[PDB]
Amino acid sequence: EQGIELEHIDSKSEFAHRIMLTNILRMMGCVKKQKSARGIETRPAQVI
Amino acid sequence: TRGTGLMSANNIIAEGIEKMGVRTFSQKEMAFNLLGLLTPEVVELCQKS
Amino acid sequence: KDTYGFSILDIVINNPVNLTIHFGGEKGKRIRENYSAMIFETIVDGKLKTEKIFKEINEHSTSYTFRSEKG
C-alpha cells in the first residue's frame, strides 16, 4: 500500500487489511478447530 | 530489511541509517533471526507464555 | 488419557498400527514425566538392576511413538 493516506483508504486497503489481519486470525482459528476436533491438546502450533 | 517488496525502495539510505549506529539487515540475516525462534528452547518458552 | 496421553478405548475400537504421544505444553510435560519415571527393576546374581523403560524418552523429547506390524 503506497501513497494511500487516510483519505484514500478504499477497496484496496480494506482487502489488504483482510489478508494481513482478518484472515490470519481465521487461519489460526481453523487450525485450532482442526486440532480440537481430533482432541490434540499437547502438540501446539507456534504462530510466528 | 533491505531488499524486499516492502522495503526495496529504501536501500539507498541504509548506509546513513547505519551511520547513526543502527543495524539494517539483509533478508538472509533476518531469516536467520526468525529461524532462531524455532529452536527447541524458544519453542518451549512460547509454550510457557 | 490423563496419565499417558492415549485412550485404551481408541486402541480397542480402531487398532492403530502406530501411536504417537506428544509432550507439548504443561499437560504434555506431565505425561512425559510419567513416561520417564517407570522402570524395569530386575535381580542379577542377587542384586538389583534398575533399567528404564522408554530409554528414548528424556527431558528433551517432544514425542514418542508406539510401533507394531498390523495393530
Swiss-Prot record, chain B:
**Can you say what this protein is called?**
Fatty acid synthase subunit alpha
The highest taxon in the source lineage is Eukaryota
* Post-translational modification summary for this protein: 4'-phosphopantetheine is transferred from CoA to a specific serine of the Acyl carrier domain by the C-terminal PPT domain. This modification is essential for activity because fatty acids are bound in thioester linkage to the sulfhydryl of the prosthetic group.
UniProt miscellaneous comment: Present with 17000 molecules/cell in log phase SD medium.
Its organism's taxonomic lineage begins at:
Eukaryota, Fungi, Dikarya, Ascomycota, Saccharomycotina
Q: Which family does the record claim for this protein? A: Belongs to the thiolase-like superfamily. Fungal fatty acid synthetase subunit alpha family.
The entry's function note states:
Fatty acid synthetase catalyzes the formation of long-chain fatty acids from acetyl-CoA, malonyl-CoA and NADPH. The alpha subunit contains domains for: acyl carrier protein, 3-oxoacyl-[acyl-carrier-protein] reductase, and 3-oxoacyl-[acyl-carrier-protein] synthase. This subunit coordinates the binding of the six beta subunits to the enzyme complex.
Task: Give the shown range, full length included.
Answer: 872 to 920 of 1887
Q: How does it assemble?
A: [Alpha(6)beta(6)] hexamers of two multifunctional subunits (alpha and beta).
UniProtKB/Swiss-Prot annotation, chain C:
The region annotated as signal peptide is none
UniProt miscellaneous comment:
Present with 91800 molecules/cell in log phase SD medium.
Subunit info here reads:
[Alpha(6)beta(6)] hexamers of two multifunctional subunits (alpha and beta).
Please give the family membership noted in the entry: Belongs to the fungal fatty acid synthetase subunit beta family.
Role played: Fatty acid synthetase catalyzes the formation of long-chain fatty acids from acetyl-CoA, malonyl-CoA and NADPH. The beta subunit contains domains for: [acyl-carrier-protein] acetyltransferase and malonyltransferase, S-acyl fatty acid synthase thioesterase, enoyl-[acyl-carrier-protein] reductase, and 3-hydroxypalmitoyl-[acyl-carrier-protein] dehydratase.
- Its protein name is Fatty acid synthase subunit beta
Q: State the organism of origin.
A: Saccharomyces cerevisiae (strain ATCC 204508 / S288c) (Baker's yeast)
Q: What is the lineage of its organism?
A: Eukaryota, Fungi, Dikarya, Ascomycota, Saccharomycotina
